[PDB]
Design an enzyme around this catalytic site. Structure first.
Site, PDB file in Angstrom:
ATOM      1  N   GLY A 126      32.498 -25.898  51.526  1.00 24.06           N
ATOM      2  CA  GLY A 126      32.235 -26.267  52.877  1.00 24.06           C
ATOM      3  C   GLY A 126      30.883 -25.795  53.386  1.00 24.06           C
ATOM      4  O   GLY A 126      30.203 -26.531  54.058  1.00 24.06           O
ATOM      5  N   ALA A 127      30.495 -24.572  53.064  1.00 25.15           N
ATOM      6  CA  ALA A 127      29.257 -24.037  53.618  1.00 25.15           C
ATOM      7  C   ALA A 127      28.953 -22.686  52.954  1.00 25.15           C
ATOM      8  O   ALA A 127      29.698 -22.249  52.076  1.00 25.15           O
ATOM      9  CB  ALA A 127      29.378 -23.881  55.117  1.00 25.15           C
ATOM     10  N   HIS A 155      30.447 -14.230  59.148  1.00 22.17           N
ATOM     11  CA  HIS A 155      30.048 -13.506  57.961  1.00 22.17           C
ATOM     12  C   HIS A 155      28.795 -12.666  58.150  1.00 22.17           C
ATOM     13  O   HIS A 155      28.528 -11.762  57.342  1.00 22.17           O
ATOM     14  CB  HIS A 155      29.745 -14.450  56.777  1.00 22.17           C
ATOM     15  CG  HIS A 155      30.898 -14.722  55.873  1.00 22.17           C
ATOM     16  ND1 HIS A 155      31.632 -13.716  55.273  1.00 22.17           N
ATOM     17  CD2 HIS A 155      31.404 -15.887  55.399  1.00 22.17           C
ATOM     18  CE1 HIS A 155      32.558 -14.244  54.493  1.00 22.17           C
ATOM     19  NE2 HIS A 155      32.471 -15.558  54.589  1.00 22.17           N
ATOM     20  N   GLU A 162      26.153 -17.993  45.574  1.00 20.94           N
ATOM     21  CA  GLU A 162      27.436 -17.337  45.447  1.00 20.94           C
ATOM     22  C   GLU A 162      28.312 -18.140  44.456  1.00 20.94           C
ATOM     23  O   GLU A 162      28.348 -19.348  44.501  1.00 20.94           O
ATOM     24  CB  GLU A 162      28.139 -17.165  46.783  1.00 20.94           C
ATOM     25  CG  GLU A 162      29.323 -16.242  46.697  1.00 20.94           C
ATOM     26  CD  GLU A 162      30.024 -15.998  48.015  1.00 20.94           C
ATOM     27  OE1 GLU A 162      29.616 -16.536  49.096  1.00 20.94           O
ATOM     28  OE2 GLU A 162      31.001 -15.227  48.000  1.00 20.94           O
ATOM     29  N   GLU A 195      30.998 -19.097  58.986  1.00 19.80           N
ATOM     30  CA  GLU A 195      29.724 -18.686  58.412  1.00 19.80           C
ATOM     31  C   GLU A 195      28.946 -17.743  59.318  1.00 19.80           C
ATOM     32  O   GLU A 195      28.431 -16.733  58.861  1.00 19.80           O
ATOM     33  CB  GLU A 195      28.884 -19.887  58.069  1.00 19.80           C
ATOM     34  CG  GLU A 195      29.478 -20.908  57.067  1.00 19.80           C
ATOM     35  CD  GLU A 195      30.375 -20.377  55.946  1.00 19.80           C
ATOM     36  OE1 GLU A 195      30.169 -19.263  55.451  1.00 19.80           O
ATOM     37  OE2 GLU A 195      31.327 -21.084  55.562  1.00 19.80           O
TER      38      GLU A 195
END
Ligand SMILES: NCCCC[C@H](N)CC(=O)O
Ligand code: NA
Ligand code: NA
Ligand code: NA
Ligand code: NA
Ligand SMILES: [Zn+2]
Length: 866
Positions: A257-258, A297, A117, A294
């Site tokens: 972050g992730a 999501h 991403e 996360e």
């Protein structure tokens, strides 16, 4: 580097439905074979335009035929004369070891991992690297057994084998179609923590958390947080996980972050690893938040993705809202709301006045990694929360259900989300859409009137948004404006008109309007914009006694804290102007008394008390001014802290001792007591010097947890106590081998008020625990200096800017995303005085001139110099 525009979106000429990848992994040279099934949707003579960056093309076949009708262009492979449906086979090479940008396939320590991403898949192979193209992936990985015993990709493991020469392979298959930004691959050697979660309908999910060898003792809390996330999503949203396996991998070299890659989240280890001696309460709560984020999501982002990147907030605003709701349901709603409001007003508002200002759905983007912003994320979530406020929970959930019902399995738009919410609720949100397309912070002005003849209270509310650098035209928004009216005794006055109840959420839709309430039996004290019901500046002429009244009586904790912020705000502005004329701090006794009352109210939640005793940060203070004087703000923050320390010394010490806890627990009541205790310690550190040194030194040596230890060390640094150098040296000695723990120390070094801080920070570039190759270290030393030591960064001699220029001259070539994070303090030059402005503009002009200026920097620097 060319801008893209939201209004240019067109559906793609070709789709890809299935892609079969094979990676022959090696750090110097990885061979990728990508076999894609493709279908033409556009004109018969449109070529297929594949995106690709830094790829070595080896071959191109169409239905097994070597293809001659193609050419390479800047960033692309253009293939002509195709049939309507065909199999594309590409073979290409990449070099993970050379990838310092950490975009695509790169090296993290001895592991190989991916970040795709927004547009990193194109750094792996030629593809339709755009999120409205969704395909079913199958990924086969081949690698050396010893170096890479674990070989991971999205979905389920379907095949496995051994090869000659100490190699092995695994194949994975993910049944859900996905845009390629959700592709992940990880190879390496890890310790693994394994656990399971059983969903509410009885699916047993294998949970697996991969961490560096030796770090398994820091894994359980993240695992616990994952299970908590899965459970909460079921209880609150009715959402279950949709696969039999969930993997998370903690890597040390990561830009953000992730990342929510389907079934295979990759996390910065900063948001996974925790032990009581390494991590603070705040780390524990952040790990919980990011794990949740996360996970959430999986529905809001993966099962429904984004049609194009201008729609980012469709996933991020909604997912941030979900992580806030999660944290708030499990913890203290009031503390969450408060801190999110601190972030909105202190940091996002500054962005929405900057040259980088954009609506939550941007219209123009040059480098899409520049738009992972406070605006897109935090303002995005505030917009979602406004929808929630207007619809109520029950209708909001119907809207969620309708959004998934219509859009599951596809790429959607912000507009599609709003439409689902309107259709499910029958609430009209046409005007509300204007929040997606207009940038900047509305200013809401309130005037009131009490009429004793008619027992009417009249509010006159007006709004306007000032022009921003991106947008000259602005129009009125649909602002949910929540109020409560308090009578003489602190009780809520029922809101009503013409014999009927009226909703306490007012619809402020015009430039100006008037609301009239009947049966207002006493002259009220209003609480205005309750719970920060819209992301706006409130202009209203409070009296101090109205504010202390709200501090003593308001029914929501948030309003109390917020009244206390309004109370200080007057005196922050006053004392900044004073400081500029050489005058010392002035504060009415009755203000100090209002805080004394909070320290001694025993009814009050200790979490609320701690928030009220945590002064606005220098960034929150700066939102109070047009032109910012960062040196005056820092000195006033300090002087106010010294003044309250002196006025409240006894009460501070008593509340500090009362909240002592022998046992350390990561539990909401314990955290709140400890947070209050440490808020007291902070003031006490700024009080009489000898007692300060004793208290702080003692807490640092006797602490049984990093929260209590770091609060002490932080206080020694901030108040420049005698024990400081010793305490700092002890922590280095003990913790130097541990990067995440050292980050905290670098932050304290960078944010020190000491006169020689810049010199200390330069020397720390040579420190054993620092390296320019690690984004976390960089952010901890350099970022913390530039972004969180504004007094030093904006030193009158300009040394701060020059240092940042040197750092960015390195980082622009090494890691442009990190560079672009770090440039943000310079981009704000137009908030500063002429003399600072000239120097910042000169620094920006140097950076404009670099050879090989990254797009990421270019976008920001160009907007800043306009
Ligand atoms: N440069 C792109 C960053 C992607 C962030 C990712 N969606 C994780 C998150 O939103 O939490
Ligand atoms: Na497709
Ligand atoms: Na997503
Ligand atoms: Na709660
Ligand atoms: Na005030
Ligand atoms: Zn996100």
């Amino acid at each position: 580097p060319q801008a893209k525009y939201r209004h240019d979106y067109r559906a793609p000429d070709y789709q890809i439905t299935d892609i079969d990848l094979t990676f022959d992994l090696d750090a110097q040279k990885t061979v990728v074979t990508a076999v894609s099934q493709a279908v033409r949707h556009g004109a018969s003579d449109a070529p297929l335009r594949l995106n690709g960056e830094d790829l070595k093309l080896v071959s191109v076949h169409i239905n097994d035929e070597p293809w001659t009708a193609w050419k390479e262009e800047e960033g692309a492979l253009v293939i002509s004369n195709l049939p309507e449906r065909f199999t594309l086979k590409i073979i290409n090479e990449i070099s993970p070891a050379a990838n310092t940008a950490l975009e695509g396939l790169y090296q993290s320590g001895d592991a190989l991992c991916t970040q795709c991403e927004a547009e990193g898949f194109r750094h792996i192979t030629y593809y339709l690297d755009r999120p409205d193209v969704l395909a079913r992936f199958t990924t086969k990985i081949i690698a050396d057994k010893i170096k890479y015993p674990f070989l991971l990709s999205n979905g389920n493991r379907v095949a496995q084998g051994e090869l000659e020469n100490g190699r092995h392979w695994v194949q994975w298959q993910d049944p859900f179609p996905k845009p390629c930004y959700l592709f992940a691959l990880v190879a390496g050697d890890f310790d693994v923590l394994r656990d399971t979660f059983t969903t509410r309908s009885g699916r047993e999910v294998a949970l697996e958390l991969y961490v560096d060898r030796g770090n398994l003792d820091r894994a359980p809390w993240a695992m616990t947080s994952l299970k908590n996330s899965m459970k909460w999503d079921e209880e609150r949203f009715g959402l279950e996980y949709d696969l039999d396996i969930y993997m998370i991998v903690a890597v040390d070299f990561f830009n953000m972050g992730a990342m929510e890659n389907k079934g295979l989240n990759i996390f910065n280890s900063k948001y996974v690893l925790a032990r009581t001696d390494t991590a603070t309460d705040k780390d524990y709560l952040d790990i919980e938040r990011v794990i949740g984020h996360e996970y959430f999501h999986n529905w809001t982002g993966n099962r429904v993705t984004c049609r194009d990147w201008f729609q980012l907030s469709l996933k991020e605003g909604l997912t941030v809202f979900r992580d806030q709701e999660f944290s708030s349901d499990l913890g203290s709603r009031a503390v969450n709301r408060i801190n999110n409001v601190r972030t909105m007003r202190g940091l996002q508002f500054a962005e929405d006045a900057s040259p980088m200002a954009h609506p939550i759905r941007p219209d123009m983007v040059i480098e899409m990694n520049n738009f992972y912003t406070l605006t897109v994320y935090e303002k995005g979530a505030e917009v979602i929360r406004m929808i929630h406020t207007l619809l109520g929970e029950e209708n909001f959930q119907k809207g969620m259900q309708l959004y998934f019902e219509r859009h599951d399995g596809s790429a959607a738009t912000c507009d599609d989300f709003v439409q689902a919410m309107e259709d499910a609720s029958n609430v009209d949100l046409s005007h509300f859409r204007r929040w997606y397309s207009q940038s900047g912070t509305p200013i809401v002005t309130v005037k009131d009137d009490y009429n004793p003849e008619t027992e009417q209270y009249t509010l006159t509310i007006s709004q306007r948004t000032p022009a921003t650098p991106d947008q000259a035209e602005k129009q009125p928004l649909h602002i949910p404006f929540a109020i409560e009216l308090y009578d003489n005794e602190g009780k809520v006055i029922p809101l009503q008109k013409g014999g009927h109840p009226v909703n306490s959420v007012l619809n402020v839709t015009q430039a100006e309007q008037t609301f009239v309430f009947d049966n207002v039996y006493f002259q009220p004290v209003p609480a205005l914009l309750c719970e920060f019901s819209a992301p706006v500046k409130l202009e209203y002429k409070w009296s101090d006694q109205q504010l202390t009244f709200l501090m003593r009586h308001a029914r929501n904790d948030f309003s109390r804290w917020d009244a206390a912020q309004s109370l200080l705000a007057t005196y922050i502005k006053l004392n900044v102007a004073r400081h500029q004329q050489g005058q010392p701090l002035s504060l009415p006794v009755h203000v100090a008394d209002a805080f004394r009352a909070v320290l001694l109210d025993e009814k009050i939640d200790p979490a609320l008390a701690a928030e009220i005793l945590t002064l606005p940060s220098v960034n929150e203070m700066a939102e109070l001014f047009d032109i910012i004087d960062p040196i005056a703000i820092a000195e006033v923050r300090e002087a106010l802290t010294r003044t309250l320390a002196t006025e409240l010394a006894d009460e501070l010490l008593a509340i500090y001792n009362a909240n002592y806890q022998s046992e350390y627990r990561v539990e909401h009541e314990d955290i709140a007591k400890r947070t209050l205790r440490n808020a007291c310690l902070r003031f006490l550190a700024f009080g009489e010097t000898h007692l300060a040194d004793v208290l702080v030194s003692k807490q640092f040596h006797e602490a049984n947890n990093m929260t209590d230890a770091l609060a002490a060390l932080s206080a020694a640094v901030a108040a420049q106590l005698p024990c400081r150098d010793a305490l700092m040296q002890e922590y280095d000695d003990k913790w130097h081998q541990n990067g995440l723990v050292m980050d905290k120390w670098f932050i304290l070094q960078a944010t020190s008020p000491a006169a020689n801080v810049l010199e200390t920070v330069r020397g720390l570039l040579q420190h054993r625990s620092f390296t320019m190759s690690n984004p976390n270290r960089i952010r901890s030393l350099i970022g913390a200096f530039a972004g969180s030591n504004p007094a030093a960064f904006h030193a009158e001699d300009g040394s701060g800017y020059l240092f940042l220029v040197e750092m960015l001259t390195d980082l622009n070539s090494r890691n442009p995303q990190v560079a672009s994070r770090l440039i943000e303090p310079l981009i704000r030059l137009k908030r500063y005085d002429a003399k600072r402005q000239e120097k910042m503009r000169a620094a920006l002009e140097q950076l404009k001139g670099l050879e090989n200026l990254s797009g990421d920097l270019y976008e920001k620097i160009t907007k800043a110099l306009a």
